[PDB]
């Protein structure tokens, strides 16, 4: 149960965009980078960026 500090704005398909306040499911990375979220609405895949991301 994470959160997106921010809403990245990726350039490329392969990361999805995201915003903040919206719910998202990290999946791996637990150092500070770039880790992969799931989305639980739609289920797409989607790499938040970690400084765009907390954990609660």
């Known amino acids: ?13 392969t990361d999805l965009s ?3 306040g919206e719910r998202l499911q ?3 990375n637990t150092e ?3 880790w992969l979220a799931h ?3 739609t289920g797409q895949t989607g790499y ?3 400084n ?5």
Do not use: C, M, Q
Request: hydrophobic share 35%; aromatic share 18%; glycine share 4%.
């Open 1 to 13: 149960t994470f959160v997106a500090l921010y809403d990245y704005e990726s350039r490329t398909e």
């Open 18 to 20: 995201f915003k903040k």
């Open 26 to 28: 990290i999946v791996n």
């Open 32 to 34: 500070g980078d770039w």
């Open 39 to 41: 989305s639980l609405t």
């Open 48 to 50: 938040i960026p970690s």
């Open 52 to 56: 765009y991301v907390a954990p609660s």
